[PDB]
Ligand binder design. Sequence first.
Ligand SMILES: *[C@@H]1O[C@H](CO)[C@@H](O)[C@H](O)[C@H]1NC(C)=O
Ligand SMILES: *[C@@H]1O[C@H](CO)[C@@H](O)[C@H](O)[C@H]1NC(C)=O
Lengths: 269, 269
Amino acid sequence: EVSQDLFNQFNLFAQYSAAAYCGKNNDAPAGTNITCTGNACPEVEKADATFLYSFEDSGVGDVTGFLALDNTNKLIVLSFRGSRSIENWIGNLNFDLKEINDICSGCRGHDGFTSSWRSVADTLRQKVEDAVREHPDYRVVFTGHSLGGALATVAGADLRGNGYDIDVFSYGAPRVGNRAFAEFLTVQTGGTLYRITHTNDIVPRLPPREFGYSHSSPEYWIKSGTLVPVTRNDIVKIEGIDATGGNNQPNIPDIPAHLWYFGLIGTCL
Amino acid sequence: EVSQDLFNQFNLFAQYSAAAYCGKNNDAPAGTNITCTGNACPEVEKADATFLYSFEDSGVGDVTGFLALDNTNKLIVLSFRGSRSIENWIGNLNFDLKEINDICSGCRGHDGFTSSWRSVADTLRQKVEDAVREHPDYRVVFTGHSLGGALATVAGADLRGNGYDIDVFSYGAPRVGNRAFAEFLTVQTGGTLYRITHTNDIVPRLPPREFGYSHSSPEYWIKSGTLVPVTRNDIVKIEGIDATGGNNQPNIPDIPAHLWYFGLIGTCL
Ligand SMILES: *[C@@H]1O[C@H](CO)[C@@H](O)[C@H](O)[C@H]1NC(C)=O
Ligand SMILES: *[C@@H]1O[C@H](CO)[C@@H](O)[C@H](O)[C@H]1NC(C)=O
């Protein structure tokens, strides 16, 4: 049972993550109001929120997402899309580590996640830092769902400690690297990671521990079912690197539990 | 407002309808339990419900669906699936009316729906008859979403007067014919038709009245939004053939609304 306030944040960032997919982003004018089809992001529409910068298919991993300004909640939000076809994406998921000491020493991250980030880091840090400058009081937040949540967790770890806090809200994210990296994500200051999971979501279960992956702590695990509305009492905080008892349990995972975090996500009606 | 009992019924056949898309029944042997992927039909799984006969791309209409026995609720249910790509189905939809006197007098119905039913009518009539025999105590219900709603509405109108009531629950069904058919279905005995629409769903708005089509009365209009749960208080009964101020408003219509009838329908997580 998280607080009402944290619940509201959870829900708002689920929707900014869903907006990565169901917005009418493509590349629409900077300064445009953010809206989603299919009632995907009503809390965001409600907010005085607008695009700062959209990207589609940037660099090495065709990274897709947007950078938003939200004057109602006083946020600068960097939201990364997951894949356009999650099932194929999962099927083809590579498990290779590559070194990332320039984030933290001893750290190995998922090779493709880190390479996709790496290849757009400069442009995006620049875009964030710009925005930080025009709104020094606003909270920087990176968010995303699935591969999106992955990217946002890497960028956040890479980009923290340069003056401004970076909070990360991630929705059903895969593991992003090795245990050293796990540990760093669990303690790193200058921003809290809120790693959100749903029931038996298949995505937070890849890559598996077996290929040398860990999950940061803590873990916010939604226990209400697919297509069931979430209340504060369906969310459970789970402590311990690689703790079991939220998403990380020995049962059959599900793709549909992946697509329901507070509402429909990773897909667009 | 509708009664709770009525609301329970509406919800249950919304799921039987949803099961026509997300059940695992392609060649499911007769007698299998009915189950769905993605929490699409929990009230159905919860009942002792099993298949009687599954069909797929049957006859001229490529009509798909199933006939089910439900011992808990004492039903025999014939469920027709809508189109596999509803957006296409929508823009490919012609407005051609055919005479259908062999169902009512001066009745004009949509050409494709009427034909598709017509070519599978005898096989299925047989199979409903068999179960009515085997379970004389059980209510016969025809149900469907979208296309499946138009089919079910047509079969019901076609197979009533033969000694067992047939009730029809349609979900976001299109218009099915001409003011005389709209009248036939308003008044016919041997059954009730429960014609359920959602907010500004587009399909109940097609074909247009401006191509000679009318809607049977009454209409149960769901006011609550897309991805919003429905309560008995969010359903309004709208009286009068082509009444307006339910789904029949001149505002701008929407496709996602079509995919949310009590829960997700017409697509499968
Ligand atoms: C965008 O929404 C803001 C308030 O959040 C509003 O003032 C503005 O007019 C809206 N723009 C359009 C084009 O609808
Ligand atoms: C099918 O459902 C019945 C009653 O609803 C149940 O008791 C039976 O075990 C089920 N069969 C399977 C394979 O689950």
